[PDB]
């Protein structure tokens, strides 16, 4: 019923100055292991050939397009040898979608070999700078220079997988664990159009190859474990999480211990990376889809979010509050009472925050009548947590919008139940110095020493790269949403 949110190709808000333009961001170094001889004449067409020299002509068209050309160093070298590959790749795409019974088992090694020599390569050094002073959302993408040929290889392989005469028992000896690992290494590509085809191809490979499903899930974890704990830099975290969001919707309902350890030890520590804003709509979908699957996991998810609650990063604190409202929308009333005292001690700090975007995001929880439903059934101990946070800061805020929302939140508590208690005067003043009971014993331990809303969002004033942008809007997607894949 639900699909993961589709990953956008260009994720930078370019509403600054549009008169300044860049210089196309051309790639510098080309490739390793190229060919020497690149001579290619035009083979005869597949449709006009007789019906018995069909597969050998299709092999020779696939024996072509395995010679790699140069688009980076000399961008206009061999234009007649580049167009015969481009017309040949476009011929095989149009041949494979319309005609029937065209793939024999002698076509399966050549279509994998044509994929493995064109795309499987070592991605070039990253043109974007790295460091603590760089916003990871404002990284300009660098398009692949061989995209006149690389696009039609991705387009051919996707129509090859989705053909009705595709036999996954024959192709599983050529699409093996070495093919999958080399395909997962390409998800760090800086071209967003390349990552979009890899997301759709890996979704089809996971869907049809049941013997690779435990291997794909393990190698994705190795990508996230390096990303969380070692490098903190990967360009395709949002594309992999969109694949995993379709896997979670197909899990078997007595949920396995392998999948529960994936939520706690992989999905929850992904919230602490500095570049969470790049992949947050895809990460928040995978967390919520676990709790729709099994609501018993609501307690370790919420106490894991409060453990990774950001304190020196205010745009991430708004994203935590946005994700936490989606969890509280689907929470059970029995799970709410188990977790609400660590939950509302954090919301007391967020309502009383000096940041106006953090304060107004937590004060919008009172507009949610389902969250206010669970508060009214637990008002005996959720009100003494929230009442000092709203009453100590009713008039002391620089923004006057927060003055209205705090008064709006305070009148919903008094109409909920008449707890008009006024014991804020002693339980603050006695605990002014109850922390000074423990301070003089802290000094007593030294007595025995011995032996010594346009303005409300962060925009980018970078110059646009108008050739790269219109190339990203001209790229039609491979598939708009990823359907679920049922667990076997």
């Amino acid at each position: 019923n639900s699909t993961p949110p589709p990953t956008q190709l260009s994720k930078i808000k370019y509403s600054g100055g549009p008169q300044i333009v860049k210089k196309e961001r051309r790639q510098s170094s080309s490739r390793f292991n190229l060919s020497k001889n690149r001579e290619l004449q035009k083979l005869p067409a597949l449709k006009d050939s007789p019906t018995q020299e069909r597969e050998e002509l299709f092999i020779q068209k696939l024996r072509q397009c395995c010679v790699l050309f140069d688009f980076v160093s000399d961008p206009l070298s061999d234009l007649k040898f580049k167009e015969v590959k481009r017309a040949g790749l476009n011929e095989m795409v149009e041949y494979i979608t319309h005609s029937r019974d065209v793939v024999t088992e002698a076509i399966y090694p050549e279509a994998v070999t044509m994929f493995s020599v064109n795309l499987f390569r070592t991605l070039p050094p990253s043109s974007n700078p790295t460091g603590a002073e760089f916003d990871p959302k404002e990284d300009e993408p660098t398009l692949e220079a061989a995209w006149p040929h690389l696009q039609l290889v991705y387009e051919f392989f996707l129509r090859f997988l989705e053909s009705p005469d595709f036999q996954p028992n024959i192709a599983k000896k050529y699409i093996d664990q070495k093919f999958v690992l080399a395909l997962l290494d390409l998800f760090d590509s800086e071209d967003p159009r390349e990552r979009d085809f890899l997301k759709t191809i890996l979704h089809r490979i996971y869907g049809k190859f049941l013997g690779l499903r435990a291997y794909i899930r393990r190698q994705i974890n190795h990508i996230f474990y390096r990303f969380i704990y070692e490098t903190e830099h990967h360009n395709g975290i949002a594309e992999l999480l969109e694949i995993l969001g379709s896997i979670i919707n197909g899990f078997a309902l007595p949920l396995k211990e392998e999948h529960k350890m994936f939520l706690i030890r992989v999905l929850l520590p992904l919230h602490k990376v500095k570049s969470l804003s790049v992949y947050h709509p895809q990460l928040a979908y995978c967390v919520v889809q676990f709790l729709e699957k099994e609501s018993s996991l609501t307690e370790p998810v919420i106490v894991g979010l409060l453990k990774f609650w950001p304190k020196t990063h205010s745009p991430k604190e708004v994203m935590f509050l946005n994700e936490l409202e989606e969890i509280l929308d689907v929470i059970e009333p029995s799970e709410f009472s188990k977790v609400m005292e660590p939950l509302f001690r954090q919301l007391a700090k967020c309502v009383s925050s000096p940041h106006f975007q953090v304060a107004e995001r937590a004060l919008y929880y009172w507009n949610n009548e389902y969250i206010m439903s669970l508060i009214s059934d637990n008002a005996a101990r959720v009100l003494p947590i929230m009442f000092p946070a709203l009453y100590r800061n009713s008039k002391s805020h620089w923004n006057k919008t927060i003055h209205g929302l705090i008064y709006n939140a305070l009148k919903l508590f008094m109409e909920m139940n008449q707890k008009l208690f006024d014991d804020c005067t002693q339980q603050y003043k006695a605990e002014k110095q109850k922390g000074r009971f423990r301070m003089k014993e802290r000094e007593e331990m030294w007595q025995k020493i011995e032996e010594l809303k346009v303005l409300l969002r962060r925009k980018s004033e970078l110059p646009q790269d108008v050739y790269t942008i219109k190339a990203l809007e001209a790229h039609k997607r491979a598939e708009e949403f990823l359907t679920a894949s049922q667990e076997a």
Binding site: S28, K178, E230
Partner: protein
């Protein structure tokens, strides 16, 4: 002293109050006796605590120093239970602190309880279920190997081989990172038979992030092997790592190339490392060419002296003639930093014929960092070729760079100017280079103006006071009538550095009537720079002029309308002791 009080302070629901009460864990252990901190405090840290990772980071940093507070070096194995729990924590800054503290504790161990308490701790971390424990086990093999028995250290080699063949690449990345450090504590016949097959397997790994770490292990492995079996054990692994399909592994061979030259030896360097160096300079990736250009001086310094100038002139120099005209700017800037250093190696006549056109082609390059790096080593070519040859081939390129567009390139000529003027003589400097040093004083960039005043101090130490009085003193005194106030202060800045070197007679009779004349300047910034200069040149003048010509001017500037002129004149009256 009460255990039931501080157990709730360290379990207090505030996170910051748990952090300050656990950063003072040394003072709690100092207050407790050294026997009760073993029986109550340390089991409490073992059993109860698991919290925020900021608390666990502060806890792991304290327990590396508890070797005296626990009872001395013969009870230090009681710190091993808590430190083992912090070595398995998922966060990488706390389990790196825990493995750092585990190495400091291991030196306090006896050789008997290393095999009883520390080696079973390594074998439990190396056989853990999660990768965070197996990663922390890799850093503990070197500090516990050379002090245990032969049967125990045969088990430690088996447990390190299992980490090098791990299922996850996170542990294989950490096993290769500690392969060279672990190999330096093994005996020679065990490196030859157990380290080599596990080093050769980590260099043929499917992940290139594991393969590049085997290159850095190849430096440490080759430097403790004899030269006779470097060809049959190490060299085919290094030859296929320089031809690797990943540029990140070819980058690590080029970045560690001079270390591989010293470790392997001078004879295999001629056979295998010289043709491998030509292929790294002619590489398809610009990051590898820039890394192989940084090493082009140090590689040719350490060649064998029987064939040094023959290898450079026939194999290296045709490859660096093409890195000069390279398209990428990082490789041109990296070559220019070290290309002048191979001028003493080739000799005088080879520098004139072959290296001097390469220097002129980089003094005129379009990149400013190529021009900066080629100026900074201009003295190194000056000791090989003569000053007669430097003034013929390179001096028209230096004079042309004195009016460069980028001011950093203009600054590099000024810092070279007192060295160049001392060798050229005073009769050549006055005719062709004196107008260059005076044109820098009226430059638009202030850092060129203040580098030219310091240049004038270094020039008169090499040429004398009577050269200054006849040539450069009337040039900087005519700058006082410039209608720009930024240049009128340059006269005061020149007098601040010339007064200490031209003596009392030139300061009193030529430079002191100029600083007293512009004390009635309209701009207030010149008016306290006069008072800041009379404090500076004050001690050089005698007491007679200091009381009759300097003091009546400093008393008038304390009646000024501006507050900063009034302050700096009042400050100069106390330093000159004229109050």
């Amino acid at each position: 002293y009460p255990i039931a009080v501080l157990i709730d302070e360290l379990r207090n629901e505030d996170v910051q109050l748990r952090l300050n009460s656990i950063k003072k864990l040394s003072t709690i252990a100092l207050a407790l006796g050294v026997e009760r901190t073993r029986s109550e405090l340390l089991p409490f840290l073992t059993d109860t605590i698991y919290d925020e990772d900021e608390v666990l980071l502060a806890l792991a940093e304290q327990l590396g120093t508890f070797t005296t507070l626990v009872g001395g070096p013969e009870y230090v194995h009681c710190l091993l239970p808590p430190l083992e729990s912090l070595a398995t924590v998922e966060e990488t800054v706390v389990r790196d602190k825990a493995v750092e503290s585990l190495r400091a504790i291991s030196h306090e161990h006896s050789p008997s309880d290393l095999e009883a308490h520390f080696v079973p701790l390594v074998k439990r971390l190396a056989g853990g279920d999660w990768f965070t424990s197996r990663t922390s086990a890799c850093g503990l093999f070197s500090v516990c190997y050379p002090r245990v028995s032969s049967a125990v250290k045969a088990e430690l080699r088996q447990y390190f081989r299992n980490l090098c063949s791990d299922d996850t690449p996170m542990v294989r990345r950490a096993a290769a990172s500690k392969l060279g450090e672990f190999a330096k504590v093994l005996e020679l016949d065990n490196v030859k038979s157990e380290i080599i097959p596990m080093f050769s397997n980590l260099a043929s790994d499917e992940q290139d992030s594991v393969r590049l770490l085997a290159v850095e292990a190849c430096v440490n492995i080759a430097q403790l092997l004899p030269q006779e079996d470097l060809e049959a054990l190490v060299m085919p692994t290094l030859r296929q790592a320089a031809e690797d399909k990943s540029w990140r592994v070819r980058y690590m061979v080029a970045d560690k190339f001079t270390e591989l030259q010293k470790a392997v030896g001078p004879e295999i360097t001629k056979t295998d490392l010289v043709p491998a160096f030509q292929n790294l300079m002619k590489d398809c990736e610009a990051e590898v060419r820039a890394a192989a250009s940084h090493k082009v001086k140090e590689f040719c310094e350490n060649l064998s002296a029987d064939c040094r100038e023959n290898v450079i002139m026939s194999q290296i120099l045709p490859c660096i003639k093409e890195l000069v005209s390279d398209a990428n700017q990082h490789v041109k800037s990296a070559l220019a930093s070290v290309i002048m250093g191979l001028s003493p190696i080739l000799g005088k006549d080879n520098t004139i014929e072959h290296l001097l056109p390469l220097f002129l082609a980089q003094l005129k390059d379009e990149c400013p960092e190529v021009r900066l790096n080629i100026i900074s080593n201009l003295d190194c070519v000056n000791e090989v070729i003569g000053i007669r040859q430097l003034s013929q081939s390179l001096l028209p390129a230096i004079v042309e760079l004195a009016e460069d567009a980028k001011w950093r390139v203009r600054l590099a000529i000024i810092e070279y100017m007192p060295l160049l003027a001392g060798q050229l003589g005073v009769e050549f400097f006055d005719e062709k280079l004196n107008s260059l040093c005076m044109a820098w004083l009226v430059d638009h960039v202030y850092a060129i103006r203040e580098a030219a005043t310091s240049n004038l101090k270094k020039l008169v130490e090499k040429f004398g006071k009577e050269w200054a009085h006849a040539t450069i003193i009337p040039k900087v005194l005519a700058m006082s009538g410039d209608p720009n106030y930024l240049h009128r202060m340059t006269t005061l800045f020149c007098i601040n550095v010339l007064s200490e070197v031209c003596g009392q007679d030139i300061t009193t009779k030529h430079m002191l009537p100029t600083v007293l004349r512009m004390a009635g300047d309209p701009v207030a910034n010149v008016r306290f720079n006069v008072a800041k200069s009379l404090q500076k040149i004050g001690p050089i003048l005698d007491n007679s002029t200091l009381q009759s010509e300097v003091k009546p001017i400093l008393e008038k500037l304390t009646q000024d309308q501006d507050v900063d002129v009034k302050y700096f004149a009042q400050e100069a009256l106390t330093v000159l002791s004229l109050a």
